[PDB]
Design a protein around this nucleic acid. Structure first.
Ligand SMILES: O=P(O)(O)O[C@H]1[C@H](OP(=O)(O)O)[C@@H](OP(=O)(O)O)[C@H](OP(=O)(O)O)[C@@H](OP(=O)(O)O)[C@H]1OP(=O)(O)O
Ligand SMILES: [K+]
Ligand SMILES: [K+]
Ligand SMILES: [Mg+2]
Ligand SMILES: [Mg+2]
Ligand SMILES: [Zn+2]
Ligand SMILES: [Zn+2]
Ligand SMILES: [Zn+2]
Lengths: 100, 378, 118, 29, 56, 177, 189, 167
RNA sequence: UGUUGUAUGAAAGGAGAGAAGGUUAGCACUCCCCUUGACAAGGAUGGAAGAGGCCGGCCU
């Protein structure tokens, strides 16, 4: 994702082993003490009633796999854009992107 | 070339050693004048292959991968634009624009655009075309407001790597071409040889622009990022490692330049007028003159030309402290005439500042030798 | 030792606001990937890890598009220092930068990770 | 094998070779 | 002599009705070279002349 | 030497003095003799004087040579439109070519135009009869640096101050009165 | 303004470039071959004579022996070599796509993973006009009574309504019109 | 036109033949296209023979346009005939050609050392072209039957179709 | 007063390149082609089939 959208990312339950720039360690604050899992459940996960409902790609209409994404992995790779906001993160004029 | 650490799948031949061998001897394997009938140019580079050596092609495409040739070209155009932007008032440049370079330009060897335009504040007296290394330029020739700069890259080899002569030839071909798109009659072409790390220019010079380009090109060849990636990729292609722990202490830019293609001579003449004082019965000290010498030193070959000045020249003259200086210039002109043409210097470095004026006056047949004074006189 | 010194002084160049030089270093260390001595390659990777942290993925030179497919055959290396520094680099790109690679690439790199479990 | 090492100005060895500064030693002799 | 991309010339536009330049001919002495002077540089110089060649 | 002259040699030369500056035109008199004879005769009798460059399409052409300035009025020296004449070595592929303007086949007047770049679609449609040479091509380019209003009209169009035949390839031009 | 020199001659070479030499290499008189010719001539001269020990050049000094070659070869001036583009990239296709090759070090193509465009692809995009054209488009992500804004007045939650219309709308329903939000009577200018 | 039409019948639109008779691809080829667009020695032998003929005719063209002198024409022709190996590349197809090439070089030495005698110095002006010209003419006497047979097979395979039983 | 008179290559989307454990080397038998001047050589060893009897099925 782009740099402003990385607060919308989900985290892995186990802490990262490379501690610097991590989002899921205790020191980073993204792994908080006395977490109630029921309260933080709908955060960055799919919720059909909630705010992150099952989306499809705006281009190809196939279902995305990340909550809050408007573009599926292939379409975002090919156009060079952030999967969540659609801002471009890559200049692809000289890259013949190969899906293979 | 040995194993780079300290002591304590499919069969076929592996092409890593053979490709290393073919890169290293490639100025001689890729001779351009052996048979001069046909040539093949590689796709995004300006490398010509004379004859189909297929390990050499892999070696070279490994080096210029990921569009490195264009990247080098744009990095040098950026660096020259940042040179001219620091210098708008001193050369009286109104503005400096970078041309929207047709993407395929830097490896298209038939025709060329301009790369930088300089627009004048007022007007620039423009001289006739000459090389970057020449000295005596008369700004009378033409007058202009636009001034273009064109960057060329080449990859030389053993039979052909004269870069001054390449710069001259490309300038006179492109500017007289019918199909040329140059924005003005006046400009300079800059040629850089990536195989040998040489550079030159040819074209029109407006006042103050030649010394600026000389310094700028020396600095750029020393410290460009994209050139660092090129030289780094070559050394990884060859698996060449340095034995020495640091760069030589005397790593100054001036010191390094002494060992380029050009002949450079140090002239030392402080010892030309040399005397001895002894005591007299009259009580006043007397000085008798003795033999002097001019030293001319060629650092690259280690040749010392020693001109012994016998005191017979000083016999009948009055002010001796200048005559010696004047003589010092006439003798240097004599030596330059005596030598073969390929032996003659391009730059002369004088240890004494006041020597700089007569010498430049006396060297008239040789206007292209520049004379200067360095900071490492010895 | 030289690659270790880059990994220590990466933060100082951020505070000294000299990101151009560190950017250049990232470009230089990218050509040293083809190392055959695993101790040197692990330190090259460690240095790279530090530059990615200090400058960020989206301003990184060579771009993450160039860096990640370079890294996927480095995964095969069985030396522990190489594997350690490479997996961290790969795993960090996998979340903060997943649009720099195609889905087939993540699938095959995913397959490769099953050998990292030994 | 034959600088391989960085140059530092060495400790004055005139006390070792001659016992004092060479110029002073000539002065006394 | 011509470029790769230039199509080969049209005779009618270019070459037709321009005067040729002089060809390489050595001057002959009108006294010493009397017999050979008239037909020396002709194409089939004695072609028409019956007494020297058989015929056309 | 990998640079080739694709064009046949010129013969005869005409000077235009304009408000942009001077323009040298040297003519292809063997290849297009009707338009060259036309152009020389109109220059010898000051037909082009105080005519504006009325149509400008930037990067394409600069049209001129209408004495009304309308874009519709020209008189050949032949009392009539004359024929087109083409040459296989004369092709619109560069800037600085001087060609005759027309509305259709075999309809040539006094109007002409300079080209300012490649114009592939003008081939075999317009008679090329001259080229601009020397430094004065740069003056020609300055004819297209105008404030162009609607229907490709300049704000203040440049105009032709005089003409001059520097070298006349023909011998029998008698100027009209 | 550039003025014309006003000459009658046409500009350019008079032979239309029919004899245009190749001048990219170093001059014939300063050349490696020519230098060698001078050295051979000087050794012919010194052959019978004594060693006089005067300097004549770095190359050519007294060699006591009787008189391809080492140097660079001089190139033909008038022959123009024909150049063609090698578009064959020679990349290992498996290594580029997948990162795996079955030949290993024996592969005779390049193991490199970059996917930039080829030169002819750049040229076709420049001809067709499709080079960079996609930068333009990005993928970033009253009215009750339909009359004039007769006192456009707000609620708690941005819903700017007309004054007497929304008083009658409260008569209809106590919540809003836009998203049926609880107004709680709160109705503001 | 003949060689270009042969290229167009085969749908080889990615190969370009320029007017100096060089055949060159316009883009990178797939494996299938490399297999299909490979031409044999008949095509190339005929193409290099035509390249030599165009070099000879263009010199006379340059003379008739006025750009060269008659002396430059004679020197250019004898340069052509002594340097067919650098100018064409005919030897790759039939290497037995080298015999003619070597012979032409041998005639040059014979003529050059006899021409450049006395005041006449070494330099590019000898124009005695009959010898070099003569050697190729004899080459052509031999190679005409061969190419008529080979090119008849190329054309028969193009128009009658491939013949199913074979030999 | 039209239409199936067909094919090649490319792009996009899919399938995936012989060997009774794995990795592979080839030369042919028949009939189907492609490159080729071929009585040569290549095109994945060029590709595709390959025991017997009875009426795709059944039996050894
Ligand atoms: O004397 P020139 O007319 O200038 O001829 C030169 C020269 O001939 P000579 O030295 O024999 O007089 C070359 O000889 P080298 O310098 O190589 O010894 C010769 O080379 P060849 O003997 O191999 O023919 C070269 O030919 P080329 O240009 O093909 O190398 C040829 O020039 P031209 O034959 O082209 O006129
Ligand atoms: K078979
Ligand atoms: K096989
Ligand atoms: Mg076979
Ligand atoms: Mg095989
Ligand atoms: Zn999609
Ligand atoms: Zn985003
Ligand atoms: Zn491979």
């Amino acid at each position: 994702v782009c740099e402003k959208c990385e607060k919308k990312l989900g985290t892995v339950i186990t802490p990262d082993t490379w501690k610097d720039g991590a989002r899921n360690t205790t020191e980073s604050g993204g792994r908080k003490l006395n977490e109630n899992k029921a309260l933080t459940s709908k955060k960055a996960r799919f919720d059909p009633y909630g705010k992150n409902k099952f989306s499809t790609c705006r281009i190809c209409k196939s279902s995305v796999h990340q909550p809050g994404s408007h573009y599926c992995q292939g379409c975002a790779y090919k156009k060079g854009i952030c999967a969540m906001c659609g801002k471009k993160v890559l200049d692809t004029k000289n890259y013949k992107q190969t899906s293979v | 070339w040995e194993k780079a650490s300290g002591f304590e799948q499919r069969s076929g031949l592996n092409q890593i050693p053979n490709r290393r061998f073919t890169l290293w001897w490639s100025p001689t394997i890729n001779r351009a004048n052996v048979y001069v009938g046909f040539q093949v140019q590689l796709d995004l580079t300006g490398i010509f292959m004379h004859g189909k050596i297929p390990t050499l092609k892999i070696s070279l495409i490994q080096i210029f991968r990921a569009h490195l040739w264009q990247k080098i070209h744009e990095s040098i155009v950026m660096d020259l634009c940042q040179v001219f932007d620091q210098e708008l008032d001193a050369l009286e440049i109104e503005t400096v624009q970078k041309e929207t370079i047709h993407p395929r330009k830097s490896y298209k060897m038939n025709s060329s655009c301009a790369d930088i335009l300089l627009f004048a504040s007022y007007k620039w007296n423009v001289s006739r075309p000459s090389l970057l290394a020449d000295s005596k330029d008369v700004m009378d020739s033409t007058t202009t407001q636009k001034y273009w700069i064109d960057i060329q890259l080449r990859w030389g080899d053993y039979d052909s790597h004269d870069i001054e002569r390449y710069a001259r030839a490309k300038f006179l071909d492109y500017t007289t071409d019918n199909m040329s798109i140059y924005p003005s009659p006046t400009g300079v072409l800059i040629a850089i040889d990536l195989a040998y790390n040489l550079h030159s220019a040819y074209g029109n010079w407006f006042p103050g622009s030649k010394p600026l380009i000389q310094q700028a090109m020396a600095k750029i060849m020393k410290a460009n990022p994209a050139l660092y990636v090129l030289r780094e990729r070559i050394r990884k292609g060859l698996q060449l490692y340095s034995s020495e722990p640091t760069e030589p202490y005397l790593s100054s830019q001036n010191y390094g330049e002494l060992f380029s293609n050009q002949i450079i001579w140090f002239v030392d003449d402080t010892n030309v007028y040399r005397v001895t004082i002894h005591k007299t019965f009259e009580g006043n000290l007397t000085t008798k003159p003795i033999n002097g010498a001019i030293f001319i030193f060629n650092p690259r070959t280690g040749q010392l030309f020693l001109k012994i000045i016998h005191t017979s020249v000083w016999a009948g003259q009055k002010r001796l402290g200048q005559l010696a200086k004047w003589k010092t210039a006439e003798e240097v002109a004599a030596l330059i005439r005596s030598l073969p043409v390929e032996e003659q210097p391009k730059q002369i470095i004088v240890t004494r500042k006041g020597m700089l004026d007569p010498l430049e006056v006396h060297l008239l047949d040789f206007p292209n030798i520049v004379i200067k004074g360095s900071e490492l006189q010895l | 030792q030289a690659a270790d010194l880059i990994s220590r002084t990466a933060v100082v160049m951020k505070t000294c606001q000299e990101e151009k030089l560190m950017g250049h270093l990232g470009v230089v260390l990218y050509e040293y990937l083809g190392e055959e001595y695993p101790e040197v390659l692990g330190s090259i990777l460690g240095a790279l890890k530090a530059i990615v942290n200090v400058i960020g993925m989206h301003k990184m030179t060579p771009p993450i598009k160039d860096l990640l497919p370079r890294l996927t055959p480095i995964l095969k290396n069985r030396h522990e220092k190489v594997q350690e520094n490479c997996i961290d680099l790969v795993g960090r790109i996998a979340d903060r930068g997943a649009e720099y690679v195609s889905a087939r690439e993540w699938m095959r790199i995913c397959f490769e990770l099953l050998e990292l479990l030994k | 094998g034959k600088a391989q090492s960085i140059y530092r100005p060495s400790k004055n060895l005139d006390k070792d070779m001659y016992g004092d500064d060479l110029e002073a030693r000539i002065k006394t002799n | 002599p011509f470029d790769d991309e230039e199509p080969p010339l049209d005779y009618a536009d270019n070459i037709l009705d321009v005067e040729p330049l002089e060809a390489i001919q050595l001057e002959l002495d009108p006294e010493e070279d009397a017999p050979v002077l008239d037909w020396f540089y002709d194409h089939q110089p004695l072609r028409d002349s019956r007494k020297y060649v058989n015929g056309s | 030497s990998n640079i080739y002259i694709q064009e046949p040699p010129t013969n005869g030369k005409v000077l235009l003095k304009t408000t942009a500056g001077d323009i040298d035109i040297e003519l292809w008199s063997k290849e297009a003799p009707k338009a060259c004879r036309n152009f020389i005769q109109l220059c010898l009798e000051a037909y082009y004087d105080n005519t504006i460059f009325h149509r400008v399409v930037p990067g394409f052409i600069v049209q001129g040579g209408d004495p009304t300035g309308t874009g519709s009025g020209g008189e050949s020296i032949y009392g009539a439109p004359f024929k087109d004449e083409f040459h296989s070595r004369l092709r619109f592929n560069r800037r600085g070519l001087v060609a005759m303007a027309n509305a259709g086949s075999h309809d040539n007047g006094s109007q002409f135009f300079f080209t300012l770049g490649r114009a592939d679609e003008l081939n075999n449609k317009h008679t090329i009869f001259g080229k601009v040479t020397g430094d004065t091509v740069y003056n020609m380019l300055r004819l297209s640096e105008v404030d162009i209003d609607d229907d490709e009209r300049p704000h203040n169009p440049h105009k032709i101050k005089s003409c001059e035949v520097l070298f006349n390839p023909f011998d029998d031009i008698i100027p009209r009165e | 303004v550039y003025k014309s020199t006003r000459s009658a001659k046409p500009v350019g070479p008079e032979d239309m470039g029919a004899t245009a030499v190749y001048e990219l290499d170093t001059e014939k008189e300063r050349d490696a071959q020519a230098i060698f010719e001078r050295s051979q001539k000087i050794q012919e001269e010194l052959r019978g004579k004594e060693d006089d020990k005067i300097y004549r050049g770095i190359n050519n000094y007294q060699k006591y022996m009787k008189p391809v070659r080492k140097g660079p070869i001089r190139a033909p001036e008038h022959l123009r070599a024909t150049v063609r583009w090698d578009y064959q990239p020679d990349i290992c296709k498996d290594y580029k796509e997948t990162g795996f090759c079955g030949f290993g070090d024996s592969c005779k193509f390049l193991h490199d993973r970059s996917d930039y465009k080829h030169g002819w692809q750049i040229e076709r995009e420049l001809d067709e006009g499709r080079y960079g054209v996609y930068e333009d488009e990005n993928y970033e992500v009253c009215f009750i009574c339909r009359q004039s804004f007769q006192n456009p007045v707000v609620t708690k939650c941005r819903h700017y309504f007309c004054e007497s219309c929304a008083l009658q709308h409260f008569r209809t329903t106590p919540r809003c019109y836009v998203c049926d939000q609880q107004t709680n009577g709160v109705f503001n200018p | 036109n003949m060689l270009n039409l042969l290229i167009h019948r085969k749908n080889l639109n990615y190969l370009h033949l320029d007017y100096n008779f060089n055949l060159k691809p316009v883009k990178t080829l797939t494996t299938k296209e490399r297999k299909k667009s490979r031409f044999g020695n008949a095509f190339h032998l005929c193409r290099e023979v035509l390249r030599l003929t165009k070099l000879v005719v263009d010199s006379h063209v340059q003379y008739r346009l006025g750009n060269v002198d008659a002396f430059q024409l004679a020197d250019g022709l004898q340069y052509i005939f002594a340097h067919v190996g650098q100018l064409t590349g005919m030897y790759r197809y039939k290497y037995k050609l080298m015999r003619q090439i070597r012979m032409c070089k041998d005639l040059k030495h014979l003529i050059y050392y006899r021409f450049n005698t006395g005041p006449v110095g070494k330099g590019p002006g000898c124009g005695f072209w009959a010898a070099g010209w003569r050697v190729w003419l004899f080459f052509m006497r031999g190679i005409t039957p061969l190419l008529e047979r080979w090119l008849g097979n190329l054309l028969a395979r193009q128009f009658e179709g491939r013949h199913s039983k074979g030999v």
